[PDB]
């Protein structure tokens, strides 16, 4: 149906007006969105969620050129193209979207997040779920493969339980880097003493 467009990192009244004028609507959440519009690669919660879902991530020019044309244009020419950020992170946004379209990055993972992590637990939970993973709101107390805990040094006192039952402690970068690149490599993010 008509696009349900989410925005991140931008203030774009013109863009919103274009969405509206062309028969689309504003998405209330990543879960509800068909498209994400932004100006460059920005690791916001919305961006990571959209990427995890595989929805098109398009520049502001998509809407402006669509309004000029009088109809929503195909997304292809408007994919966000940010070579500086691609170089920095060692990834391709198009290739990561392709991976998200082929499979759910975190299916089969169960992930708990300790309270001091950034982004905070409920925001991590949104990202996790957008990648098809299972967010755990309660502390896990038994071992299962791919059941992991995202934590940080500040939260060491909160890791006694997962440490005992053998659940890996991972830095937030497991998700911040992994979801951006659409790779799940927990080994690389295990926290040392």
């Amino acid at each position: 149906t008509a696009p349900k467009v989410l925005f991140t990192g931008v203030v774009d009244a013109r863009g919103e007006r274009a969405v509206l004028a062309l028969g689309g609507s504003l998405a209330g959440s990543a879960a509800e969105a068909s498209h994400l519009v932004t100006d460059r690669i920005r690791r916001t919660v919305k961006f990571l969620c959209a990427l995890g879902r595989g929805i098109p991530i398009l520049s502001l020019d998509w809407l402006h050129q669509s309004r000029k044309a009088g109809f929503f244009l195909p997304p292809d020419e408007y994919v966000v193209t940010d070579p500086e950020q691609e170089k920095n992170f060692g990834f391709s946004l198009q290739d990561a979207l392709s991976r998200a379209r082929e499979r759910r990055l975190l299916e089969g993972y169960e992930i708990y997040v300790t309270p001091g992590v950034q982004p905070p637990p409920p925001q991590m939970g949104e990202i996790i779920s957008c990648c098809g993973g299972t967010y755990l709101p309660s502390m896990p107390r038994s071992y299962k493969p791919q059941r992991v805990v995202i934590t940080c040094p500040q939260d060491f006192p909160h890791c006694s339980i997962p440490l005992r039952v053998g659940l890996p402690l991972l830095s937030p970068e497991f998700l911040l880097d992994g979801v951006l690149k659409q790779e799940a490599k927990p080994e690389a993010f295990v926290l040392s003493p």
């Binding site: 990192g9 920005r42 690791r43 916001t44 982004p119 937030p172």
Partner: peptide, 4 residues
């Protein structure tokens, strides 16, 4: 919005 916040970036991370």
């Amino acid at each position: 919005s916040q970036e991370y």
